Amino acid sequence: SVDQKAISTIRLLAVDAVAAANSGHPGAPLGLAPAAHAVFKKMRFNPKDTKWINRDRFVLSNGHACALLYSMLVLYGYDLTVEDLKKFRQLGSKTPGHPENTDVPGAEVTTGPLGQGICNGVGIALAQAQFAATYNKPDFPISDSYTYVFLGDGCLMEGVSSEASSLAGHLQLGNLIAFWDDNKISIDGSTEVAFTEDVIARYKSYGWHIVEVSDADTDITAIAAAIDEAKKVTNKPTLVRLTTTIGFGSLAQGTHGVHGAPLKADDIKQLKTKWGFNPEESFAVPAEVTASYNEHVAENQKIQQQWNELFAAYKQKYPELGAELQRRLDGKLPENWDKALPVYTPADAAVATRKLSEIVLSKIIPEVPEIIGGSADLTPSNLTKAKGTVDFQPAATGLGDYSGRYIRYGVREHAMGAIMNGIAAFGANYKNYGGTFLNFVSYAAGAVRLSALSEFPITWVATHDSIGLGEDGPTHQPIETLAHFRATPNISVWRPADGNETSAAYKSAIESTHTPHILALTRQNLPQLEGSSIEKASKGGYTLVQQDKADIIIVATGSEVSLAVDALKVLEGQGIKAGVVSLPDQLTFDKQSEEYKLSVLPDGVPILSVEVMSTFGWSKYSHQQFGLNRFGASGKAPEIFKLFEFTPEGVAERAAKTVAFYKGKDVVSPLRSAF
Amino acid sequence: SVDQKAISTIRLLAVDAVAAANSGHPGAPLGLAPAAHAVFKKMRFNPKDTKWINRDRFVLSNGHACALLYSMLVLYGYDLTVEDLKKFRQLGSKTPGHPENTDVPGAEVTTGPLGQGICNGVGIALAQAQFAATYNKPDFPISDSYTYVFLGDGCLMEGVSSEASSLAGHLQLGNLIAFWDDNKISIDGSTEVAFTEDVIARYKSYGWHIVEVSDADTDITAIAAAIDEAKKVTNKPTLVRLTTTIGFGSLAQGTHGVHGAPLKADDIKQLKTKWGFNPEESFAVPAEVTASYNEHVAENQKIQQQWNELFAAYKQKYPELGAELQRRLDGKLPENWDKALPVYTPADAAVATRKLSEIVLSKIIPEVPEIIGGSADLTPSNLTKAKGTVDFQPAATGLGDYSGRYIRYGVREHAMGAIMNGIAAFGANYKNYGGTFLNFVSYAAGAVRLSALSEFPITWVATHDSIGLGEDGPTHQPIETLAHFRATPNISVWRPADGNETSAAYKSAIESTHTPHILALTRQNLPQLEGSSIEKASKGGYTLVQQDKADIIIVATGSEVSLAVDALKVLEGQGIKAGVVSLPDQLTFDKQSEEYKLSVLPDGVPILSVEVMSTFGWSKYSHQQFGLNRFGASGKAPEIFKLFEFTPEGVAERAAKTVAFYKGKDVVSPLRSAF
Ligand SMILES: Cc1ncc(C[n+]2csc(CCOP(=O)(O)OP(=O)(O)O)c2C)c(N)n1
Ligand SMILES: Cc1ncc(C[n+]2csc(CCOP(=O)(O)OP(=O)(O)O)c2C)c(N)n1
Ligand SMILES: O=P(O)(O)OC[C@H]1O[C@H](O)[C@H](O)[C@@H]1O
Ligand SMILES: O=P(O)(O)OC[C@H]1O[C@H](O)[C@H](O)[C@@H]1O
Ligand SMILES: [Ca+2]
Ligand SMILES: [Ca+2]
């Protein structure tokens, strides 16, 4: 049949791609080709419009199997060709060894790090439910799409998927349909060696619906029926158990050897002949298969055409919502939304930057409907919920509604991070955030790094940033955390000092389209600074206190800017003139012009950095660094600052030593380099 | 009764400690006091010998509840007093806001970051089973101890606990007995808002035994009986569901408000009067309670006395095993064990450092019985199993035995990290390791940081360290990873260049008693270096190529040392004389004398670093840094190195630019500083 020919075509494209690269993973593509064929036949999508907002989404959580995904995209006429398949895993190609959303048309997210994709799918489904609740009206199903996810045993072993699956079941996300590749093989061999849990029983315990397909090597009728069944269960996410043979068809099927290396050439020959293909030919695409797939594309394009007319009619019937929806689909924030950002003067009271963050959110959430977010069980500590908003919950619970804007993530930082990536991936201009203590953003590093690589504008509201949190002690106090994330490409790490800087940090975070943000915020109160503004802080780094005859410039962030200002006064009594630079985001600063940066960190003057955590990175901006390179302590915060000499006098002492160290020396800006 | 008085004493000590600090968590201590009383009465321990190897272990995974733990330790006469309780959460005290094994007598591990403790308990239990299988003989139950863990809803939400619980069930760890504080409250309020899964059904799906105690506020008879029942189930870990009221007894019991802030003074008064205590008195310890607890200590000390005689008799009956056991309990490695480390010459073949690591393990595992370890489903890629060894599995499976030495962790990096901490915490000189790709050590950051804070000598075998891995691409290629861990206090991050350096890295890792190790190892082959040795590499940094008239010194690690040596030859043709420094571990180097360090990185010469990942930290050792501060690429590894100009010519160009940049300048060692 044509369906059988399509499945063979998919299998052999994937195998041939791996063969050409002499690298990659043929096993899961061989095992999952029937399911991929069946799922894509049920999906609504336009290969010529990858951003249609009512498309079904597909996520390959077992991203090593990407030769399968690329084969589907090629067969369906996405902007990816057989010539691209021939360049699988080759430098600069459109077919990298794991799928990257920035590079691969039809890759919704970046997968390969196990466990992430299923969580991303939870986030796509969460966003779809919130979006539909916000916009759908009687006779106007603006959003009614599904989220289909493939995942393997490795994803099921990774704790992040447990977190997201518990939460998805709680949230009754009925438009999520996941498929477990139940092939009983991982890299170390049989799953009997390490993974003997009853997966199905676990998923039932989360409140998921289950469908089992006992012969997923051949039974596409049952896979299609499983999808139909899942669609009828509107209040539970569904897990479809696909019992497959890894490497189905290979001489080496059902073995770990078929997981992650190219097949032998003789094996590929016998695959081709058993399935009616020419063993002398590679990258065959039978015209029957193209025709069948094209029929499905044409039908999907007519569905999108009708959706476009539905949307036009929606804009007439619901003028205000229609304009809002249009704006969001155009990727534009509300005009002058930023006029809602709070502004402060030096006469205003001292405030913790966690509380300043609460106040920002309180003002901007009503102004910008595409902002949603939550906390990982730290809502009253991170201060991440705007008073008067409703939680995102299924209405059946009585605890919220899908139109809600505040997500109770529970104690699930890693899944929160990956779910945020999924919400961003949904599109529609979602600007979403997640709160935890800065030290526990580290629990989510797997996902955070992918926010950066995937270029998603997600935001971490990361409070309790330092030893300033006090008594909870060294298990809670960041040391390495900012260095880690600043050393990751494409992460803005804002550490605002005061009210105006906190508003600049949010302006950046919400306006972002390609760069994730971490906002490092304080437990303790900080004064409003003389010289701060949204305008200046928006440059990432700026001259707070200009001193034309400076003996030294002190560069600082966050809670240490006020400390630097106080140290300036101590230094004046010692006959030393200091300037102060505030550096609320190193990435934003780095992106400014060379001349702007040199106006902040000029030649001819020693520069001392002050920040109460690792000194790593700080030599980019300073000659000497005063930081904290040991773990913290459990005590009242001011006593910890005193212990480590982060006091006006301690900073002044190190500033005076720095001035003395450079006496008789020629000093150029830390911004200078040899190459 | 005396038991009722003990429970009230525990509750009120905990409440009074929080009150004195005006900080901390009274709710879970109030709810768990009955269970703590019951468990400690069943436990065998010696307050005067915290390291007795056959003690039962207790772990407080919900570490915020530590006022409870400290109260138990005080009541039982550990080296912790009521005066220490009065200094709860105060700078420098023995009663920090979360328990720290380095500081608190009777704290087996450091908890507070949720999810970690239960995983640590899995590791303690894994070690106990391996230890017992290794040493026990007929009539010689050298090891027969239990591992008791308290955990809350937060630990159950964290994915790391799912990973460890799946694995513990697979491993049939019958001496693990965990207790869930089922109080239906977390920081964000009712667990109904975020955590509605059927926990018990999930634990059954992992192969755990369950006991439910419906009134754990009062029913210590049922809690004791649950322990007895758990002890009869020898092939399953047990979860005991303790249905409690958070803050039991408080006016605010059963609310989130009682979780994490001090009680009101009037609330504490009514607690005291309801329980027969003086509301005017704080830190009361009724002498009846002390007497009852002392009886249990005296009985436990007689048990340890008899164990000591058993051990003496064991050494007579089993002379070889007895001497081995003695040596391990003395904390000493075998005499001259390091003579088994492989040594190489520059005439030997090029080898990947992952393969050199395999070879080291193959030689030292037979020599050093206290080495055990595993991989997170990457055994044939990390090369972490010595041929001929048996896996750690329950014999019932036929897949291994508890005497085995190789652990199949599955795709569970975070739990692997926390389990390693538990194995180290068991003691008996265990030197344990865990393999994954370096980029996915980041999944385990929560645990890795605790290895450092807890001072545990665990080892990560972290292969595929860079763009050198090639085709798997940027989702797999570390950039930020070494900077992150080097910026964490107390982590040795070894990046060996060749065979001799790899042996030095293992010598350090195995000899360690207080410092975790990460060994960053290559996929690709590297040459044996002229000038390397175990002796020199053991210093962390050393002069590989000395050049008395150097125009520049190139400092490098790992795969980039050979690159630097090749660049030296290119520079010679340009009339530039270079020296080369190899810096296999920055922490070990930093610990050398100032004079030694200056012999490696002298004044008066420009120094260029070369390492194919983040430049963060490198200014400690260099004036200019050539690194990789963007994500990688999917392609053949040599082509990626060429793309980013990590070639002999690219290094030479930057070296020549560095020499030119410092012409006419006075250059001092990067090791110099102003303070
Ligand atoms: C977080 C993470 N850890 C480790 C790996 C390395 N890795 C790639 S695939 C795989 C396991 C393969 O098992 P499974 O998901 O069952 O895939 P299948 O063998 O069925 O193809 C591992 C451990 C990874 N990609 N991501
Ligand atoms: C990894 C991590 N994330 C977040 C926190 C902050 N935190 C401390 S206790 C807690 C939750 C309390 O819930 P539970 O464990 O049920 O404790 P109980 O309220 O019953 O005392 C949270 C989120 C933490 N300590 N560790
Ligand atoms: O005063 P906050 O810092 O907001 O919160 C106090 C504690 O309450 C919660 O357990 C938090 O995790 C803290 O440990
Ligand atoms: O050749 P190796 O790098 O050891 O392993 C090749 C692949 O096989 C496994 O999926 C690994 O995770 C890799 O992606
Ligand atoms: Ca599998
Ligand atoms: Ca709880």
Coordinates of C-alpha atoms in Angstrom, one line a residue, chain B residues 279-593:
Chain B
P279 CA 4.6 29.0 79.5
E280 CA 7.2 31.2 81.2
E281 CA 10.0 28.8 80.4
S282 CA 12.0 28.2 77.2
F283 CA 14.3 25.3 76.3
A284 CA 12.9 23.0 79.0
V285 CA 14.4 19.5 79.1
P286 CA 12.5 17.4 81.7
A287 CA 14.9 15.0 83.5
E288 CA 12.5 12.1 82.8
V289 CA 13.0 12.6 79.1
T290 CA 16.8 12.7 79.5
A291 CA 16.7 9.5 81.6
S292 CA 14.6 7.7 79.0
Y293 CA 16.8 8.7 76.1
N294 CA 19.9 7.9 78.1
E295 CA 18.6 4.3 78.6
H296 CA 18.4 3.9 74.8
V297 CA 21.9 5.4 74.4
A298 CA 23.3 3.0 77.0
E299 CA 21.7 0.0 75.2
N300 CA 23.1 1.2 71.9
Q301 CA 26.6 1.6 73.3
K302 CA 26.4 -2.0 74.6
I303 CA 25.4 -3.0 71.0
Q304 CA 28.4 -1.2 69.6
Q305 CA 30.7 -2.8 72.3
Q306 CA 29.5 -6.2 71.2
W307 CA 30.0 -5.2 67.5
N308 CA 33.6 -4.3 68.4
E309 CA 34.1 -7.8 69.8
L310 CA 32.5 -9.2 66.7
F311 CA 34.9 -7.3 64.5
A312 CA 37.9 -8.5 66.6
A313 CA 36.7 -12.1 66.1
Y314 CA 36.2 -11.4 62.4
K315 CA 39.8 -10.4 62.0
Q316 CA 40.9 -13.7 63.5
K317 CA 38.5 -15.8 61.4
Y318 CA 39.0 -13.9 58.2
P319 CA 42.5 -12.4 58.4
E320 CA 42.7 -10.9 54.9
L321 CA 39.2 -9.4 54.8
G322 CA 39.7 -8.2 58.4
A323 CA 42.8 -6.3 57.6
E324 CA 41.2 -4.8 54.5
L325 CA 38.2 -3.7 56.6
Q326 CA 40.5 -2.2 59.3
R327 CA 42.5 -0.3 56.8
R328 CA 39.3 1.2 55.3
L329 CA 37.8 2.1 58.7
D330 CA 41.2 3.9 59.4
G331 CA 40.6 6.0 56.2
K332 CA 43.8 4.7 54.5
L333 CA 44.2 3.5 50.9
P334 CA 46.2 0.4 50.2
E335 CA 50.0 0.9 50.6
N336 CA 51.5 2.0 47.3
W337 CA 48.2 1.6 45.5
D338 CA 49.3 4.3 43.1
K339 CA 52.0 2.1 41.7
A340 CA 49.1 0.6 39.6
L341 CA 48.6 3.9 37.8
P342 CA 49.5 3.7 34.2
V343 CA 52.6 5.7 33.0
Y344 CA 53.3 6.8 29.4
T345 CA 56.1 8.2 27.4
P346 CA 56.1 10.5 24.4
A347 CA 56.8 7.4 22.2
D348 CA 53.4 5.9 23.1
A349 CA 50.4 6.2 20.8
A350 CA 47.8 9.0 20.9
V351 CA 44.8 8.0 23.0
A352 CA 41.5 9.8 24.0
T353 CA 41.4 10.7 27.6
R354 CA 38.1 8.8 28.0
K355 CA 40.1 5.7 27.0
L356 CA 43.0 6.6 29.2
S357 CA 40.4 6.8 32.0
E358 CA 39.1 3.3 31.2
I359 CA 42.7 2.0 31.4
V360 CA 43.3 3.7 34.7
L361 CA 40.1 2.2 36.2
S362 CA 41.0 -1.2 34.8
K363 CA 44.3 -1.1 36.8
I364 CA 43.1 0.5 40.0
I365 CA 39.7 -1.2 40.6
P366 CA 41.4 -4.6 41.3
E367 CA 43.9 -2.8 43.6
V368 CA 41.5 -0.7 45.6
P369 CA 38.3 -2.5 46.8
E370 CA 36.7 0.7 48.1
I371 CA 36.4 2.0 44.5
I372 CA 32.9 1.5 43.1
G373 CA 31.1 3.6 40.5
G374 CA 28.8 3.7 37.4
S375 CA 27.4 5.7 34.5
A376 CA 24.2 7.4 33.7
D377 CA 23.4 5.1 30.7
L378 CA 26.7 6.0 29.0
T379 CA 28.8 3.0 29.9
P380 CA 30.1 2.2 26.4
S381 CA 30.7 5.9 25.7
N382 CA 32.2 7.1 29.0
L383 CA 34.2 3.8 29.2
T384 CA 33.6 3.6 33.0
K385 CA 33.3 -0.2 33.6
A386 CA 36.4 -2.4 34.1
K387 CA 36.2 -5.6 32.0
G388 CA 35.4 -8.6 34.2
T389 CA 33.7 -6.8 37.0
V390 CA 30.1 -7.5 38.1
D391 CA 27.3 -5.0 38.2
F392 CA 25.8 -3.9 41.5
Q393 CA 22.3 -5.5 41.2
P394 CA 20.1 -7.6 43.5
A395 CA 21.0 -11.3 42.8
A396 CA 17.3 -12.0 42.4
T397 CA 17.5 -10.3 39.0
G398 CA 20.3 -12.5 37.7
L399 CA 22.0 -9.2 36.4
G400 CA 24.6 -8.7 39.1
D401 CA 25.0 -9.0 42.9
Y402 CA 25.3 -6.6 45.8
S403 CA 29.0 -7.4 45.9
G404 CA 29.2 -5.9 42.5
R405 CA 31.2 -2.8 41.8
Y406 CA 29.5 -1.2 38.7
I407 CA 26.3 0.7 39.0
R408 CA 23.8 1.1 36.1
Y409 CA 22.4 4.5 37.1
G410 CA 20.2 4.9 34.0
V411 CA 19.5 8.3 32.5
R412 CA 19.6 9.9 36.0
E413 CA 22.5 12.4 36.3
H414 CA 21.1 14.4 39.2
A415 CA 20.2 11.4 41.3
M416 CA 23.5 9.8 40.4
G417 CA 25.2 12.9 41.8
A418 CA 23.2 12.8 45.1
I419 CA 23.6 9.0 45.4
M420 CA 27.4 9.5 45.0
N421 CA 27.2 11.9 48.0
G422 CA 25.3 9.2 50.0
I423 CA 27.9 6.5 49.1
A424 CA 30.6 8.9 50.3
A425 CA 28.7 9.7 53.4
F426 CA 28.4 6.0 54.3
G427 CA 32.1 6.1 55.0
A428 CA 34.5 3.1 55.0
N429 CA 36.8 5.0 52.6
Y430 CA 34.4 4.6 49.6
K431 CA 35.9 6.4 46.6
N432 CA 33.0 6.4 44.2
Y433 CA 32.5 7.8 40.7
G434 CA 29.8 8.5 38.1
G435 CA 30.1 8.9 34.4
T436 CA 28.2 11.1 32.0
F437 CA 29.0 13.6 29.2
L438 CA 30.4 16.8 30.7
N439 CA 27.6 18.9 29.3
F440 CA 25.1 16.8 31.3
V441 CA 26.9 17.1 34.6
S442 CA 25.0 20.4 34.5
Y443 CA 21.7 18.4 35.0
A444 CA 23.1 17.4 38.4
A445 CA 24.3 20.9 39.6
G446 CA 22.1 20.8 42.7
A447 CA 24.0 17.7 43.9
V448 CA 27.4 18.7 42.7
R449 CA 27.4 21.9 44.6
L450 CA 26.5 19.9 47.7
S451 CA 29.5 17.6 47.1
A452 CA 31.6 20.7 47.4
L453 CA 29.8 22.2 50.5
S454 CA 29.7 18.7 52.2
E455 CA 33.4 18.0 51.4
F456 CA 32.8 14.6 49.9
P457 CA 35.5 12.9 47.7
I458 CA 33.2 11.9 44.8
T459 CA 34.3 11.9 41.2
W460 CA 32.6 12.7 37.9
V461 CA 34.0 10.9 34.9
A462 CA 32.8 13.6 32.5
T463 CA 33.7 12.7 28.9
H464 CA 33.0 14.4 25.6
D465 CA 34.3 17.6 27.1
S466 CA 34.2 20.0 24.2
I467 CA 33.5 20.7 20.5
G468 CA 36.0 17.8 20.1
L469 CA 33.0 15.5 20.4
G470 CA 31.9 16.6 16.9
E471 CA 28.6 15.7 15.3
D472 CA 26.3 15.6 18.3
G473 CA 26.5 19.3 18.1
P474 CA 25.9 22.3 20.3
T475 CA 23.3 20.7 22.6
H476 CA 26.1 18.4 23.7
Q477 CA 29.2 20.6 23.6
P478 CA 30.2 22.4 26.9
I479 CA 31.0 26.1 26.8
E480 CA 30.1 27.4 30.3
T481 CA 30.5 24.1 32.2
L482 CA 34.1 24.3 33.5
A483 CA 33.7 28.0 34.4
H484 CA 30.6 27.1 36.5
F485 CA 32.3 24.3 38.5
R486 CA 35.6 26.1 38.8
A487 CA 33.7 29.1 40.2
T488 CA 32.2 26.8 42.9
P489 CA 34.3 26.6 46.0
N490 CA 36.1 23.3 46.6
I491 CA 35.8 21.5 43.3
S492 CA 38.9 20.1 41.6
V493 CA 38.2 20.3 37.9
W494 CA 40.8 18.2 36.1
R495 CA 41.2 18.4 32.3
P496 CA 44.1 16.1 31.6
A497 CA 46.0 16.5 28.4
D498 CA 47.5 13.0 28.1
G499 CA 48.2 9.6 29.7
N500 CA 50.4 10.9 32.5
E501 CA 48.1 13.8 33.3
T502 CA 45.1 11.4 33.4
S503 CA 46.9 9.2 36.0
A504 CA 47.7 12.3 38.1
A505 CA 44.0 13.3 37.9
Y506 CA 42.9 9.9 39.2
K507 CA 45.6 10.0 41.9
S508 CA 44.1 13.2 43.2
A509 CA 40.5 12.0 42.9
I510 CA 41.1 8.7 44.8
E511 CA 43.4 10.3 47.4
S512 CA 40.8 13.0 48.1
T513 CA 39.1 13.1 51.4
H514 CA 37.4 16.5 51.3
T515 CA 37.2 17.7 47.7
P516 CA 35.0 16.5 44.9
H517 CA 36.5 15.9 41.5
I518 CA 35.3 16.5 37.9
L519 CA 37.5 14.8 35.3
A520 CA 36.9 16.5 31.9
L521 CA 37.8 13.9 29.3
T522 CA 37.9 13.8 25.5
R523 CA 36.2 11.8 22.9
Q524 CA 39.0 12.5 20.4
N525 CA 42.6 11.2 20.5
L526 CA 45.4 13.3 22.0
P527 CA 49.2 12.8 21.7
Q528 CA 51.4 11.8 24.7
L529 CA 53.3 15.0 25.6
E530 CA 57.0 15.5 25.9
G531 CA 57.6 16.7 29.4
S532 CA 54.5 15.3 31.2
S533 CA 54.6 13.1 34.3
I534 CA 52.4 12.1 37.1
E535 CA 54.8 14.0 39.4
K536 CA 54.6 17.3 37.6
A537 CA 50.9 17.1 36.8
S538 CA 50.1 16.4 40.5
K539 CA 51.0 20.0 41.1
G540 CA 47.9 21.1 39.2
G541 CA 49.9 23.3 36.9
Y542 CA 53.4 23.0 35.6
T543 CA 55.9 24.2 33.1
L544 CA 55.7 21.7 30.2
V545 CA 58.1 23.5 27.9
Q546 CA 60.5 25.9 29.6
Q547 CA 61.9 28.8 27.5
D548 CA 64.4 31.0 29.3
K549 CA 64.1 33.8 26.7
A550 CA 60.3 33.5 26.2
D551 CA 58.5 36.3 24.4
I552 CA 55.3 34.7 25.6
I553 CA 54.0 31.8 27.7
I554 CA 51.0 29.8 26.5
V555 CA 48.9 28.3 29.3
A556 CA 46.5 25.6 28.3
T557 CA 44.5 22.5 29.4
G558 CA 43.4 19.2 28.0
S559 CA 43.2 19.0 24.3
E560 CA 44.6 22.5 23.9
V561 CA 48.0 21.7 25.4
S562 CA 49.0 19.8 22.3
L563 CA 47.6 22.7 20.2
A564 CA 49.9 25.1 22.2
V565 CA 52.9 22.9 21.6
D566 CA 52.2 22.9 17.8
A567 CA 51.7 26.7 18.0
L568 CA 55.1 27.0 19.6
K569 CA 56.6 25.5 16.4
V570 CA 54.7 27.9 14.2
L571 CA 55.8 30.9 16.4
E572 CA 59.5 29.8 16.1
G573 CA 59.2 30.3 12.3
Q574 CA 57.8 33.8 13.0
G575 CA 60.8 34.6 15.3
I576 CA 58.8 34.3 18.5
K577 CA 59.9 32.1 21.4
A578 CA 57.2 30.6 23.5
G579 CA 57.0 28.5 26.7
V580 CA 54.1 26.2 27.4
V581 CA 52.3 25.6 30.8
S582 CA 49.8 22.8 31.3
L583 CA 47.2 23.5 33.9
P584 CA 45.3 20.3 34.4
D585 CA 43.6 21.4 37.7
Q586 CA 43.3 25.1 38.7
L587 CA 42.3 24.3 42.3
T588 CA 45.3 22.0 42.9
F589 CA 47.5 24.7 41.3
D590 CA 46.1 27.5 43.5
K591 CA 46.9 25.4 46.6
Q592 CA 50.6 25.3 45.7
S593 CA 53.1 27.7 47.3

